[PDB]
Amino acid sequence: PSISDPTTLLEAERNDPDGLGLPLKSVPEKVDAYIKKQFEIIKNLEDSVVGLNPQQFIKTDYFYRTSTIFYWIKEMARGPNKVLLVPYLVDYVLPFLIGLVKHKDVCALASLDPVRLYAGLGYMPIRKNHVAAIVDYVCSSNVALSSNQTKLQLAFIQHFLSAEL
Amino acid sequence: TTIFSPEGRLYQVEYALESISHAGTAIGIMASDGIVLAAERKVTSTLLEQDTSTEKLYKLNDKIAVAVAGLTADAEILINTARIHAQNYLKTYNEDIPVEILVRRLSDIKQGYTQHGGLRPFGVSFIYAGYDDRYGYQLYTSNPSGNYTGWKAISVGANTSAAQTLLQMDYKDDMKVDDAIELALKTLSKTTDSSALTYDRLEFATIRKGANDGEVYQKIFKPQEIKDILVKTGITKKD
Amino acid sequence: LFNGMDSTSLLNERLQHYTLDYVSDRAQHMKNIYDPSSRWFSRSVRPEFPIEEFLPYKTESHEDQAKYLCHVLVNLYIAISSLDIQGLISISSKDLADLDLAGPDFNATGKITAKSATIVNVNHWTNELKNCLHFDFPVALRKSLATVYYYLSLVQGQKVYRQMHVDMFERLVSLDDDRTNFTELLQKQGLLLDHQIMLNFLCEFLPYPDPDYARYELSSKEDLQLFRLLLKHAHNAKPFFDKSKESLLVDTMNFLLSSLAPSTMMAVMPIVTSVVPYHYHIHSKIIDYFPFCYSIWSSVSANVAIDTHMYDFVGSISKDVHNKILSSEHEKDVVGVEFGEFGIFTDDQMTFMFNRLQGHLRTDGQIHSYSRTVKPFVYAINGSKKDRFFEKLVSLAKAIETFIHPSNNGFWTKPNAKFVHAFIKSYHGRVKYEEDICARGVTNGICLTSFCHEEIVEIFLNIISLGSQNKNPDIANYYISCFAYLLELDPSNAYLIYDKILIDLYDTLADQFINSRHRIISSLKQFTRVIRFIVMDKLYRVHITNVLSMLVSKLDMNDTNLTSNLINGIVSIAAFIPIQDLTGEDDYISFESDTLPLVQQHFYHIKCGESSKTFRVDDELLNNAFKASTTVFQSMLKVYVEKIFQLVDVDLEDSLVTKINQTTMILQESMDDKIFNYFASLLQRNFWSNDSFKEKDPNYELVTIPLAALVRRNNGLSKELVRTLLFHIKEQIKRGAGSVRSTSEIQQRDVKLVLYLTALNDVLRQCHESLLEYSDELITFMKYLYDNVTNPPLDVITSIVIHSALATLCTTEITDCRLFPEDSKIPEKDRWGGLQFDPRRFDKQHLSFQWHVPSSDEITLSISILESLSEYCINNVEELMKAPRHDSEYGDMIQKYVLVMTHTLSGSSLLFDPDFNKYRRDLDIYTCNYYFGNTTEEKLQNPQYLQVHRVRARIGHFFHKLYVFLSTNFENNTNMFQILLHGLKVWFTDLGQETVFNEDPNAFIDVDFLENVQSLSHVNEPFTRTNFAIRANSLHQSRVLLHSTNRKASKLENLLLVDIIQLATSLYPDIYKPAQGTLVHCMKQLVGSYGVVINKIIPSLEKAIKDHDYMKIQVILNVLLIKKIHRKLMTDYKDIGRLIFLLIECCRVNELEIGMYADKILTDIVIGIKIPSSVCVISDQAFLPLAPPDGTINLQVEAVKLAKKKKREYYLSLLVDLQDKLLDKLDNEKDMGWKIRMFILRFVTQIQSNLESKPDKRAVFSIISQISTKHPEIIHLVVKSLLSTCNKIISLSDYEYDITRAYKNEFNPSFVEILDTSTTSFPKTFTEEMNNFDNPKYFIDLRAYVGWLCWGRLMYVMSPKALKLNLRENELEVLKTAGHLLTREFLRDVTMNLVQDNETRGVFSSGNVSFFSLVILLISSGFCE
């Protein structure tokens, strides 16, 4: 956060009336937009995989992007970076991970594990602000989910509710 | 009880390897014309019979010898099995046993005592030595796991690491048996826990060729012969 | 007397300056000591049990305790203002002219006389003050001492014993010392302490810009231990940081906040928790940093390292605001901090912590300290707004309830068990803290109500039920321990807890759980925890004697574990209940006709499903059923004695045999004279008429300790018991017992003789004054017993008869331990609980103990027995000294009388006196009860004092006359040397106290056992009369064992010590191992004894090496490895020189395992100690608080500064001499092998790496030339020692030759500059400087941290300009000597040898990298070619 003054840090943390302060760490706005642009590139590239089998899906730019963003999320979800990931959960990261789960043979040809990753994201340090948005996202019924995605959403709501007792 | 540690490693073999890591030091060196074996013997007993004919060093047949680190009770069971196999090969083929066939024979028995849970492994490490026409002078090591390896010079038992470093810097591929006498005595004097090396603390042997073309000869040295190589080498605990 | 303290008018003005000028009346002093408005006021709470008023003799006057403390404080001042905080220089009383002691430096023991010697060690005099703290001293003298031990604990420059100095401050500021909160009394006196000295020392654990100058680093275990120790001292002192410095909180936070980064997290978080005070100004409050702590805590996963510090922070701030609101001081200290629904926590903070609390109990296990974890939650509860807090606690308990259940074991079990215990313990600690405020004042309404204790039982009752049935019995004990706290709250719900424990206990004893051993054992454990509460309630008390007889009848000879848990229940019943018939001559009462009917009705009601609150009965029927319950005791004791005689033959553990003796004696002390007389006549009839001593090795103690306890309560029983025993002894000797030889085993033909002799020994030890009646008979029987039995194993037993006889006559001890006294005291028969929760438990009329204080008639008998039995044994051995024989009989006869002469010295041991040799002041603070008087004047004006000492001397002279006989005729015969060495051990040790027979099981009740039974947390002295009695016995016993026996020899001790030193050097293991143990003990007894021992062992090793005395040489090296000798070698510079060269000659003795022991001793001498040269960085407030008013003490601290300085330099000239003599030996001897050559390298490396030592180019040349040995480990040691010697020379330039800068903060080297990161554009200047490769303005080696969270502090930074050295000539020559020998060829074969050693390891070494970094300095300085 590199705040200019100790008193500016103190005022900024006292400004939220709930007595929980600001996040300890935060992404600067150009870095934030770079992170979001990688997911929007993936969302525009979805048209390039609509017809094809896993063996050539593994040879697409869409998959190379997706496999990189999987390794980025998976490394961000360890150690001191989990807080950097909670701002991207309901808009980009969770939508991306349920997206990957449709491609179960791609997750077998490349040794990816969207299931273990997404279920494990229920245990991250999520703020009171983000709990309500996480709850409205997981409580959104879309008929577009297959059983694997809806039972993954229940698995999340299992490791989330138990981690929100 | 011969079950794997969760890393895929055998607890009993590791504990047998801890046991031999205390069990007295032995060096072997392979010269261009013979093999030297030497072993350091912790004589903390005055009334123990020094000038007993063996403890650390043993004959397996007319051209093969061993040094032992580990339990001597365990070693003597393997040593007899190797002696029986050497003579059973000689009886079958009319020819003296090749060193590789016998060293690995004792490495196959020692692996079996590590797999079945009714058996404890053998707490013994062997530095084999010998000659045959298939290769020439050969120096091998074998340990409680049933692993075996070929060497130009090696130590086993206590103080292995200091001894390997001292061997490595002075060993030459073209050296003679008398240079290997000197080297093995120097190495042990530069590795010993006891204040200085002497003829009763030391077991020694050689595998030379001699003067006569058909000979290979295995002098397992008596104490008086060891006193002569001690006073010639400059270790020389002499009047 | 050096201190000047012999002057009466200096003592008077010292006493007044220390405010120890007490009023001479005991009554007026004991009044004004507890008055807040008094000059002399040491305690705010008066002790309910003044344990030293219950002793049968005059304890020391308050005037003499004051005198003793004043002496300690002037000597503790002189020690500190003389600057030698490490203590090692050992200034002699001889060094007073130019104008010998062991133990105290680490793991001390106190020589409690204020004698004529002055020692000038800070570690000695702080140990005396730790012993002085047992008495009282005004809070103004406590203020001075808290000031001293604050700054004396923050000392730098030397190796202080910091841990006992920290614990001294902690004792002075205590939150609970006899219910007095001394921190708040010192806060009212106005103690102010400097947070900046503490904050700076904690900031030495932050990363320093140069790796070479970082004084302390975590991961190193000594620095981690130092950090943890200073953090403790920061917590203890935090309450004394000044309220009026309004910026202190915000300025300390501004510094620590800006210091916070990933690298500094592990330092800064404990520094924030420890140093920052809880001040609450109008503008700045510590609660403003809650948003900041929740910012760190809310952004990370549960981690022990981050979570323990933030529970500690918010928990102790919660406890402080709660405590301030209950105290009157909130109007000063916490106005505007309102207490809310959840304390200081907002709803989101409490919602977060409850979520984080279950986060560890159910998912991650990340708790370390449970008592800290639960503290925010216990001190959150507002007792008038409780409902939303208790709503979160019912839902927490519902979440964790399944993780408690006994088939659900896993990582969460230990977390849950400790959370439940700590929450319930802590809530009970809160309840009993605020009940004490309520008792003397008013109730705030944040205080908990009855409804809150009810709610707590309703939440935790199922949790404690599930957790007590666990498979792990230490886990089960955490939940079982919660029941006592829940009952001690006295809830309206308490029937729920009692009903459960009755149901399960009746179901176990009725064998309904016979398949389930955990239900058997856990129900016995549960019942044992609550007996003391079941005993008080008029309904549940009707069940206890029914349970007692059911427990006694169930005692078992096969199951030693069930018997242990039954015996826990039986002794817990016995300790609280009077074993007395309460029936009022009510001829209608019976147990079968009143008690047992009502018990069946109550049990049937409770087992149907009803609560005990529904059960109705008349108080008439209830009192008849209770009175009838007390008529059942005599048949219970009949079964008890019968079970005790069956346990005599069982293979029991010593712990259970001891426990069985404790329960048997606690039963006896609880009996009225009616029931006990029946039990005493029952314990003696079974003893004579037994069938119970059959096995090879019987438990004689299980019957003979009970008989001796009968004789302790009633002296009248002894005459017939002793008379009958000695008749049965004489019969067994006539039947031939002890007439067949064996060694190391008692024969089965002897077992009855051993019974009657051990019964005699135990009974005699309790006869006291009843012994006077049959004394002549016992002496004539003792002679007969020494004439007629000669088996070696029986001699130890038959000689212990005299010990036990003598001991009774001169010992001072409690006779009466009764639960209720005399059959005649005022408490009404409504006394079924042992007064434990009453105010009159403390009553002097309840606690009128009676003591054996020795009679003049008993001492005259004691001296008469002593001199008679010792003359007897002297004369008998002297008649065997004519005409020795090698016969097995001849040795066993010699051993007998010598054994008898050792047990006449035991027992009469209370008559001897350590100071007798001084005769031909001395303030002993501990007044152990002596017979001849405490003054020298009294002792020598009694002719029985001289008669006793004459005998001691005459037995000691006989042990020397015996040692020359045995060493000349029988020098192989080990057992009579072992008996002689035991005789010598007792003769050296047992002066005025008993050290053998001190710890072995005896017929007094155990204070630790009865404290384990009756102690209850947060409850004050919940004890009965038995426990108060044995506590008063333990007090006198302590004074006797705390009385110092250290003394100077009288020529006889030297003659006998020289024989012990000879035997310690003997070639037989069985003589030398005992003799070395005896030598350790005899050194403790004598002053300067280590000098006398080393004066003998050094010449003897030298003679043994000359003589080729192999075997003796290895025995001598085993003497040098004695911990007490070995530790004293390290601080003995004059004899280490001659010892080292003699160990070097020993390193070429090729025999046995010699050389390998000398190598071990030489390896340990490399941890020898050096003295810092005036390196003492300290505050003046470490000593100025105790500066007396006088001019004379200034001149004496100046004298010690000078004298001690000369001794330090004298020790630094002996190590330099030894360095030079070893380097001489290193260059001179071209053939010295390698192990010995590597001893000269490490020793010289330690002297040349120390900053006090002058550099020497011959050391550098000689160490560098050992490259030529080609030995790998000598080359590794040469690169390491070269590097260490040069890093010192480099640092001598950087400190500018002022060695003290090495130990000062506020000094930074000239290549370090300080940047102000507060400046108005610094945050962007840093990111453009950290980008700059072309022309850097500065640098940051090691790790950065300032500016990660925020800017604002001073940042330490390294300048761009190169490190040019400003060295002097001697330092330049040594670096040029290295640089001259740093040739291409030296580098080439050093590096080649490092390559060849690393061939299997493949490690990267920073020690090699810093070697090339050092070479580059010598290149760039032009010292290297």
Query: Is C1153 within 8 Å of B44 when comparing Cβ atoms?
Result: yes
Closest listed residue to residue C1241, CA positions, set C1202, C1271, C1196, C1199: C1271
Q: Which amino acid is at C183?
A: T
Between helices C473-480 and C413-439, what is the axis angle to 10°? 20
First to last CA, chain B: 55
Query: Is B169 within 8 Å of C1396 when comparing Cβ atoms?
Result: yes
Closest listed residue to residue C1005, CA positions, set C988, C1022, C1028: C1028
- Give Cα separations from C1352 to A7, A14, C260 (angstroms): 10, 19, 12
Q: Which amino acid is at C886?
A: H
What one-character DSSP code corresponds to residue C1317?
A: T
Backbone angles phi, psi at C137, to 5 degrees: -160, 145
Closest listed residue to residue C395, CA positions, set C449, C440, C428, C351: C351
What six digits make up the tokens of C1350?
Answer: 């925020």
Distance CA C871, CA C1115 (A): 37
Q: What angle do CA C480, C483, C484 make, to 5 degrees?
A: 110
| A117 touches A74 (CB < 8 A) | yes
What six digits make up the tokens of C740?
Answer: 């067949």
Query: Is A2 within 8 Å of C346 when comparing Cβ atoms?
Result: no
Closest listed residue to residue C351, CA positions, set C51, C114, C359: C359
Q: In this complex, does chain C touch chain A, defined as having at least 3 beta-carbon pairs under 8 Å apart? A: yes
Distance CA B33, CA B180 (A): 10
| C570 touches C527 (CB < 8 A) | no
How far is C-alpha C1015 from the geometric centre of its chain's CA atoms? 19
Q: After which residues is chain A broken (C to N over 2.5 A)?
A: none
Closest listed residue to residue C794, CA positions, set C739, C843, C719: C739
Closest listed residue to residue C1365, CA positions, set C1287, C1303, C1302: C1287
Distance CA C1382, CA C1425 (A): 8
A162 burial via Cβ count (<10 Å: 0-12, 13-18, 19+): middle
- Give Cα separations from C1407 to A78, B166, C1266, C1276 (angstroms): 34, 22, 19, 10
**Contact residues on chain C for A9, CB-CB shorter than 8 A:** 257, 292, 1349-1350
Closest listed residue to residue C626, CA positions, set C586, C570, C663: C586
Q: Compare CB distances from A165 to C253, C258, C399 and report the shortest one's residue.
A: C399
B164–C contact, CB cutoff 8 A: yes
| C448 touches C383 (CB < 8 A) | yes
Distance CA C1019, CA C1058 (A): 55
Give the residue on C whose Cα is nearest the Cα of B237: C1150
Tallying the residues shown for chain A, one arrives at 165
The DSSP secondary structure of C946-963, one letter per residue, reads HHHHHHHHHHHHHHHHHH
What six digits make up the tokens of C683?
Answer: 């314990």
Please state whether beta strands B34-40 and B26-31 pair in parallel, antiparallel, or not at all (unpaired): antiparallel
- Give Cα separations from C963 to C795, C981, C985 (angstroms): 20, 10, 14
What one-character DSSP code corresponds to residue B128?
A: E
| C195 touches C182 (CB < 8 A) | no
C contact chains, 3+ CB pairs < 8 A: A, B
C1108: left (phi over 0), alpha (psi -120 to 50) or beta: left
SS3 sequence, C1221-1241?
HHHHHHHHCCCCCCCCHHHHH
Closest listed residue to residue C1018, CA positions, set C606, C488, C410: C488
| 3-state secondary structure (DSSP) of residue C759 | helix
B195–C contact, CB cutoff 8 A: yes
| A157 touches A138 (CB < 8 A) | yes
**Contact residues on chain C for A123, CB-CB shorter than 8 A:** 301, 363
Query: Is C1149 within 8 Å of B195 when comparing Cβ atoms?
Result: yes
Query: In sequence order, what are the residues at sequence separation of 6 or more whose Cβ sits closer than 8 angstroms to the Cβ of residue C369?
Result: C308, C311, C312
| 3-state secondary structure (DSSP) of residue C137 | coil
Residues C41, C44, C50, C51, CA torsion sign: negative
Distance CA C1131, CA C1211 (A): 9
Measured from the Cβ of residue A114, the count of other Cβ atoms closer than 10 Å reads: 24
Please state whether beta strands B4-5 and B9-10 pair in parallel, antiparallel, or not at all (unpaired): antiparallel
**Contact residues on chain A for C358, CB-CB shorter than 8 A:** 165
Buried b (16+ CB within 10 A) or exposed e, C1140-1158: bebbbebbbbbbbebbbbb
What six digits make up the tokens of C765?
Answer: 């030890």
Query: Is C355 within 8 Å of A125 when comparing Cβ atoms?
Result: no
What six digits make up the tokens of C1338?
Answer: 């500065």
| C56 touches C924 (CB < 8 A) | no
Distance CA B130, CA B197 (A): 26
- Residues pairing with B124 in the sheet: B70
C1424 burial via Cβ count (<10 Å: 0-12, 13-18, 19+): buried
Closest listed residue to residue C402, CA positions, set C367, C358, C458: C358
What six digits make up the tokens of B234?
Answer: 């400059």
First to last CA, chain A: 30
What six digits make up the tokens of C1393?
Answer: 């040898």
| C722 touches C774 (CB < 8 A) | yes
Measured from the Cβ of residue C576, the count of other Cβ atoms closer than 10 Å reads: 24
Chain A contacts to C (CB-CB under 8 A): 1-10, 13-14, 16, 18-25, 80, 82-83, 123-125, 127-128, 162-165
Residue A127 Cα, gap to closest chain C Cα (Å): 7
Query: In sequence order, what are the residues at sequence separation of 6 or more whose Cβ sits closer than 8 angstroms to the Cβ of residue C1212?
Result: C1170, C1171, C1173, C1252, C1253
Distance CA C350, CA C370 (A): 18
Backbone angles phi, psi at B10, to 5 degrees: -105, 110
C816: left (phi over 0), alpha (psi -120 to 50) or beta: beta
What one-character DSSP code corresponds to residue C241?
A: S
- Give Cα separations from C993 to C810, C988, C1042 (angstroms): 11, 11, 9
| 3-state secondary structure (DSSP) of residue C1086 | strand
Q: Which value, to the nearest 10 degrees, does the dihedral of the CA atoms of residues C207, C210, C215, C219 take? A: 50
Distance CA C1151, CA B237 (A): 13
Which residue spans within C1342-1397 are E strands per DSSP?
1354-1358
Q: Compare CB distances from C1397 to B165, B195, B201 and report the shortest one's residue.
A: B165
Distance CA C989, CA C994 (A): 8
| 3-state secondary structure (DSSP) of residue C443 | coil
Between helices C162-172 and C139-151, what is the axis angle to 10°? 150
Q: What angle do CA C578, C579, C583 make, to 5 degrees?
A: 90
Query: Is C1271 within 8 Å of B164 when comparing Cβ atoms?
Result: no
Residue with tokens 């073999």: B13
What one-character DSSP code corresponds to residue C59?
A: P
Indicate the helix (H) or strand (E) that contains C486. helix C482-488
Distance CA C1379, CA C937 (A): 75
C774 burial via Cβ count (<10 Å: 0-12, 13-18, 19+): middle
Distance CA A5, CA C762 (A): 79
Between helices C195-202 and C248-258, what is the axis angle to 10°? 10
Backbone angles phi, psi at C1026, to 5 degrees: -55, -45
Please state whether beta strands B64-70 and C813-814 pair in parallel, antiparallel, or not at all (unpaired): unpaired
Query: In sequence order, what are the residues at sequence separation of 6 or more whose Cβ sits closer than 8 angstroms to the Cβ of residue C391?
Result: none
| C1097 touches C1119 (CB < 8 A) | yes
| C151 touches C1179 (CB < 8 A) | yes
| B97 touches B105 (CB < 8 A) | no
Domains and CATH numbers, chain B: 1-236 (3.60.20.10)
Distance CA C1161, CA C1163 (A): 5
Residue B190 Cα, gap to closest chain C Cα (Å): 7
Between helices C718-734 and C775-788, what is the axis angle to 10°? 20
**Contact residues on chain C for A2, CB-CB shorter than 8 A:** 1323, 1347-1351
Q: Compare CB distances from A164 to C294, C355, C1352 and report the shortest one's residue.
A: C355
Closest listed residue to residue A54, CA positions, set A67, A72, A43: A67
- Give Cα separations from C1380 to B149, C114, C1262, C1288 (angstroms): 46, 61, 13, 19
Indicate the helix (H) or strand (E) that contains C667. helix C654-670
What number of helices (H) and strands (E) belong to chain B? 6, 11
What six digits make up the tokens of B113?
Answer: 């005592």
Distance CA C1065, CA C1070 (A): 12
Give the residue on C whose Cα is nearest the Cα of A164: C355
Q: Beginning with the edge strand found earlier in the chain, give each strand of the sheet holding B64-70 in spatial order.
A: B57-61, B64-70, B124-132, B136-142, B148-151
| C900 touches C799 (CB < 8 A) | yes
Distance CA C1421, CA C1417 (A): 6
Query: Is B169 within 8 Å of C1270 when comparing Cβ atoms?
Result: yes
Q: Which amino acid is at C241?
A: F
The DSSP secondary structure of C70-83, one letter per residue, reads HHHHHHHHHHHHTT
Distance CA C1349, CA C840 (A): 61
Query: How many contacts, defined by CB atoms under 8 Å, are there between A and C?
Result: 99
First to last CA, chain C: 64
- Give Cα separations from B115 to C83, C596, C1188, C1254 (angstroms): 67, 66, 79, 63
| C657 touches C650 (CB < 8 A) | no
| C1180 touches C1221 (CB < 8 A) | no
A contact chains, 3+ CB pairs < 8 A: C
